[PDB]
Symmetry: C3
Subunit: 107 residues, 3 copies
């Protein structure tokens, strides 16, 4: 039950040892799919429009297809609002941004 | 420290050995745990309608709840946009989506 | 080759042993890592209003920054309608969700 002679015996099997050992590398590989999941957030945006946002329980699909290219515009939605054309403007936006929280702070 | 006698001796514990010798299978189970999140994406859809569209700080509650069952319909939402009725028509839809780049590429 | 004197030899390295022996705890941490991703669903809701939803290929952003504080309100849409201040009221929701199935059934 577990020993130097036992571990070294696995290399002679050339069958179970692959699964038994490759599992260690497989652990890190498993961790990989989780990071993959963040793209789904992008998929939900496409999914919302592509099939229908409100409870679906189909002509709008032709128009929904623009969301394909929408990946580019989507990143721009956040960037164009903060700075708008020039980046120096972002600094200006940064000051008002702090000012807006003060206004909404008290209902 | 650590040997045939040490590993076998641990069996006398009858408590730690279970958690220590079952985590290995549990590692693969973690992979199952993360794949569970994929269904969670439907929850966001429910949450978006059930939260009141844009954060606003309602009959929609009764209808939004049945989105519970709507999860079944949600999988169908994608199937209905892509194929429509039969699983043959979808071959054509696959073509128009790729074709859309051509239509949207001009001008 | 795995042995009493072999395992204890790793501590002398004071380098690889940390990475080699800390991955085991890290596997459990990965479990924490996958659950971390769920908050992104919350971010997506924020993003929906903040960047837009329908294929978006100056006045709009000042209002959207209101959503900054809106994060607090965002969690309240679900909590207030679902439970309504006290938990005793949540029991009403508990019964309402079951009966609600009867209503969407016919549609």
């Amino acid at each position: 039950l577990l020993e130097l002679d036992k571990w070294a015996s696995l290399w002679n099997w050339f069958d179970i040892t692959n699964w038994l050992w490759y599992i260690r590398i497989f652990i890190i590989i498993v961790g990989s799919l989780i990071g993959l999941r963040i793209v789904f957030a992008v998929l939900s945006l496409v999914n919302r429009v592509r099939q229908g946002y409100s409870p679906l329980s189909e002509r709008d699909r032709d128009r929904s297809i623009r969301l394909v290219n929408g990946s580019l515009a989507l990143i721009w939605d956040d960037l164009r609002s903060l700075s708008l054309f020039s980046y120096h403007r972002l600094r200006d936006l940064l000051l008002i941004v702090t000012r807006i929280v003060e206004l909404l702070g008290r209902r």
